[PDB]
Design a binder for these strands. Structure first.
Ligand SMILES: [Mg+2]
Ligand SMILES: [Mg+2]
Ligand SMILES: [Mg+2]
Ligand SMILES: [Mg+2]
Ligand SMILES: [Mg+2]
Ligand SMILES: [Mg+2]
Lengths: 136, 106, 172, 190, 197
RNA sequence: UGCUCCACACAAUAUAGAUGGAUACGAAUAAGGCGUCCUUGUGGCGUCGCUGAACCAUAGCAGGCUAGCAACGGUGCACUUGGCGGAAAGGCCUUGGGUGCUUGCUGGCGAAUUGCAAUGUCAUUUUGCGUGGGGAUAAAUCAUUUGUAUACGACUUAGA
RNA sequence: AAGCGUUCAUAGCGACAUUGCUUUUUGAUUCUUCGAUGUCGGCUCUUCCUAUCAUACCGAAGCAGAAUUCGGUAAGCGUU
């Protein structure tokens, strides 16, 4: 009775789109797209995280599902207030993707003693979990 | 436990070579788990062993060893140049070597 | 040519007793460094005035930077170049943020679409289009439509390993 | 040239439900069900308001935005085929020998048996593809009608019928004898 | 980092998978390739079929039994692309090629073993969309491989046996991931959350 | 006193190269996976990816002797119940009891002198010889013979 | 493509010019062989090329039929 068409949503290259820089002097920081230059290049700015206003290839950029209201061509001061007003950092930090980023950084910084504590604790956690499966 | 490895696994790749002439004095080693020259700078100077067996017993052991050390980085992918006390016998291309953690600055 | 740099090269003829204080001719040059800059200057003064490097002088070499290196602007560039069988003028358009980077894109464009090397190209004029609708190319005009928005289908993720265990997808 | 985005629109009548897979298009109407596989273009179908479907190409060249308008008309024709139908009218032209066309049967296949084409003793046999219906009409002499839900099915079966009557080893500007297509239309356009 | 690495041939480009496998064997890694009939080649089918016909016509003139052999099976077409990337006439290349097994379909014991892919050889990651490609099943059959329909009947048989393996594994993954989820918000769980695990 | 199998005993023999674990859907990639729900769909909603940097495993004289506590689990060893797997099955899933071990938690005893490092030896292949526990009890070739064969070999037949 | 082809450049041709290909002609060269590579033709036998005479399937004509002519794929199979 109803036309059921798979929408197939995507991340859109646009002003106000939020990017996670992978390669460069930033390499893990957040920035906002300020102006699309061409199909492969944009104008980004990450003033709260410290990314300078630069033209960057989209191939050293990973668009995120975060957007916020932003006029095209907005300067750093304008971008800074709307970044803080829209709570871009908080919305990013609560997502599972950013949590996994912090988890891999937390794991890399473990000492030898801390890793040993992880082992003893993971055996304590698995003792209750495995007897949970047996009785259920 | 069941793991006792105090070294890092490694493969003997080849000798240092041009297109047509090789240099047996220098071996090329792939360290399991490095892919960047700046990661290979960690292992510079570390003692490499190649461990192999023989039927004839030498000094109470049927196991022999050749000792080398990492001397510098090779290429862009974590391959390291290594010089052994006696050059590796070129049949060990693809064989496992043990890259140790000593001498240690870490 | 890590980047092109724009220089002003001001030069003059060598002063003589009969005609001291010559006319102080100046050009804008796109070059990788100040050596090529001074070289290209004399190459163009040959095309106009009766002077060469021996009978001339370089009075000033000043690098010119963008007044606003971080605002995207529409650039119109006129290029006279040499084909394999003749000389041709053409006018192209590049969307970018600086004159030096548009020239970098332009030299890539000539060498890619016309096989014209840096050797064969004469940058006639690099002019930013001041207001919209004086942009005459559809490959730049398509980037000036209001509320522009496009996706990037078929994302290819460069793995750091030779073997992967997941059959990776291309979503984005 | 690489256009940023090129766009086509597919109107949907009220009785038609269009369900899009990855790219398998299904159009279900009054006259049956037509499905098509479109895995070979890399387009994005999106629905607007249940009577207007949109198909898009992002970052496409000349040869590929051309393929955007072909998939528009393929979906259009399947939709038109389940509402108005597709009906082809063919005539029989022959100079001397009458052309004898009759629907015969061999193991449930229902061939178009053509006889006496230019005095040939050879029997011509054109199968009917599943989903086509063929009737010989009346009030017009020596005319055959091919009907079905999909234009692809019916036009190919008309082409199969026309091509089998090709005159060999003769000047075909004089020996014009053969079954030809006269009118391509819809089953219900009144 | 596995004692035997098993690559699923499906979706891969034949030459780029052959470049990786050649260098993998030469470094001492044992490699097993399965489902070689779903390998892919860039270019349309007819173009690649012509390239095989040019290869078929070259043979020793005075004795065809000693000339270049023209192997039909897609596993041996892939193996033919591995040779030429390996110094096969040397004893080191002979020892390398001993570290290779290539198969049509997925035979035992590899049916119940983990399969990997090579993202630099995957066609969906490598080829520009819209560019045509050839499948090694159709090419091999079109030049005389006799076992496409046999492998298909056994491959679909394995998929049925494997889909219902994944059916009960989904049920067991559900039960395990439930007790682990309940184990959260506990004392031990919140300590491992600070230590990253 | 020949052969074969099973077990453990000593020697040799080698090693294309163990040093925690080859950790199993299928398809698509202009799409999917997981979970949940409903009217069971080419369905709705949520969630995930953006790499395996994972997951499992992992502490003890290369991992010893012993005391409890909690719990009825985890894992190993043979034995075992039933089913499935012929593409190269030769493996997978089970069932029941027995015997260990447990680092899930709390204790006690031992380790040293390999002297400041020396692979500091822990594997699986092949072969002999031995010991004790089962099992079986042939052919082929030459020579003779045939001519469906044949230069010779070969082939094809017959002979207690 | 100036003309021929009843008219009509290009069905089939095609002047004046001009661009090539081939190595089955003959020239031109003298690099190899003069302590020798047996020399013309024919017979015999195999294979290859395609610039296709025939045979298969076609396209075109100044193709009504017939017989032809031009052209395509094609050397599979023949050519006394
Ligand atoms: Mg080498
Ligand atoms: Mg070298
Ligand atoms: Mg015909
Ligand atoms: Mg005729
Ligand atoms: Mg040779
Ligand atoms: Mg030809």
């Amino acid at each position: 009775t109803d036309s059921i068409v798979k929408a197939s949503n995507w991340r859109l290259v646009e002003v106000g789109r939020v990017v996670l820089i992978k390669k460069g002097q930033s390499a893990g920081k957040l920035a906002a797209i300020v102006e699309i230059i061409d199909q492969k290049k944009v104008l980004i700015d990450g003033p709260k995280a410290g990314v300078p206003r630069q033209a960057i290839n989209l191939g050293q950029v990973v668009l995120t599902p975060l957007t916020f209201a932003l006029p095209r061509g907005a300067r750093t001061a304008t971008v800074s207030k709307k970044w803080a007003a829209a709570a871009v950092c908080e919305k990013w930090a609560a997502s599972s993707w950013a949590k996994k980023i912090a988890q891999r950084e937390r794991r890399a910084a473990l000492t030898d003693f801390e890793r040993f504590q992880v082992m003893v604790l993971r055996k304590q956690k698995r003792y209750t979990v495995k007897k949970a499966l047996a009785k259920a | 436990a069941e793991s006792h490895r105090l070294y890092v696994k490694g493969k003997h790749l080849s000798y240092q070579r041009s297109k047509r002439v090789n240099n047996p004095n220098v071996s090329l080693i792939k360290i399991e788990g490095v892919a960047t020259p700046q990661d290979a700078q960690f292992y510079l100077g570390k003692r490499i062993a190649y461990v192999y067996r023989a039927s004839k017993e030498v000094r109470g052991s049927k196991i022999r060893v050749m000792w080398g050390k990492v001397t510098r980085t090779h290429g862009n992918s974590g391959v390291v140049r290594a010089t052994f006390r006696n050059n590796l016998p070129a049949k060990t291309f693809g064989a496992s070597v043990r890259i140790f953690l000593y001498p240690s600055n870490i | 040519m890590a980047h092109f740099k724009e220089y002003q090269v001001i030069g003059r003829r060598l002063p003589t007793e009969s005609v001291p204080e010559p006319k102080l001719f100046r050009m804008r040059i796109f070059a990788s460094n100040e050596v090529i800059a001074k070289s290209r200057y004399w190459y163009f003064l040959q095309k106009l005035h009766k002077v060469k490097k021996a009978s001339g002088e370089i009075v000033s070499i000043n690098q010119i930077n963008e007044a606003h290196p971080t605002k995207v602007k529409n650039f119109g560039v006129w290029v006279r170049y040499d084909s394999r069988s003749g000389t041709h003028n053409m006018y192209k358009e590049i969307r970018d943020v600086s004159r030096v980077a548009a020239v970098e894109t332009l030299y890539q464009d000539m060498a890619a679409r016309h096989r014209a090397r840096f050797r064969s190209i004469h940058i006639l004029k690099v002019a930013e289009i001041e207001k919209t609708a004086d942009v005459k190319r559809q490959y730049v005009k398509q980037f000036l439509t209001k509320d522009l928005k496009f996706p990037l289908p078929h994302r290819v993720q460069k793995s750091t390993k030779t073997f992967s265990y997941k059959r990776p997808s291309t979503f984005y | 040239m690489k256009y940023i985005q090129t766009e086509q629109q597919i109107e949907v009548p009220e009785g038609v439900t269009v369900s899009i897979k990855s790219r398998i298009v299904k159009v279900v109407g009054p006259r049956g069900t037509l499905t098509k596989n479109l895995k070979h273009i890399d387009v994005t179908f999106t629905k607007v308001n249940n009577q207007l479907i949109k198909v898009a190409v992002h970052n496409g060249g000349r040869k590929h935005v051309a393929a955007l308008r072909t998939v528009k008309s393929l979906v259009d024709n399947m939709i038109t085929g389940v509402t108005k139908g597709y009906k082809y009218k063919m005539r029989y032209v022959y100079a001397h020998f009458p052309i004898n066309v009759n629907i015969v049967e061999k193991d449930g296949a229902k061939f178009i048996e053509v006889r006496n084409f230019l005095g040939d003793k050879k029997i011509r046999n054109v199968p009917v593809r599943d989903g086509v219906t063929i009737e010989f009409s009346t009030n017009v002499k020596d005319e055959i009608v091919l009907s079905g839900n999909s234009v692809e099915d019916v036009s190919q079966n008309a082409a199969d019928l026309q091509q089998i009557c090709r005159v060999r080893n003769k000047d075909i500007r004089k020996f014009l004898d053969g079954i030809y297509v006269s009118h391509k239309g819809f089953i219900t356009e009144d | 980092v596995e004692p035997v690495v098993v690559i699923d041939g499906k979706g891969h480009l034949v030459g780029r998978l052959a470049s990786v496998v050649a260098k993998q064997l030469l470094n001492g890694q044992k490699i097993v390739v399965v489902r070689a009939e779903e390998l892919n080649i860039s270019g349309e089918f007819f173009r690649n079929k012509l390239k095989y016909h040019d290869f078929l016509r070259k043979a020793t003139a005075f004795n065809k039994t000693r000339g270049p052999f023209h192997f039909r099976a897609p596993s041996r077409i892939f193996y033919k692309a591995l040779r030429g990337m390996v110094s096969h006439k040397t004893a080191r290349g002979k020892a390398a090629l001993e570290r290779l097994k290539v198969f049509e379909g997925i035979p035992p014991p590899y049916d119940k073993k983990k399969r990997v892919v090579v993202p630099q050889a995957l066609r969906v990651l490598r080829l520009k969309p819209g560019r045509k490609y050839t499948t090694l099943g159709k090419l091999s059959t079109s030049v005389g491989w006799k076992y496409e329909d046999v492998v298909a009947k056994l491959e679909a048989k394995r998929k049925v046996s494997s889909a219902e393996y994944y059916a009960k594994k989904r049920a067991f993954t559900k039960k395990v991931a439930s007790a682990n989820a309940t184990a959260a918000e506990s004392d031990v769980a919140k300590q491992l959350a600070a230590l990253g695990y």
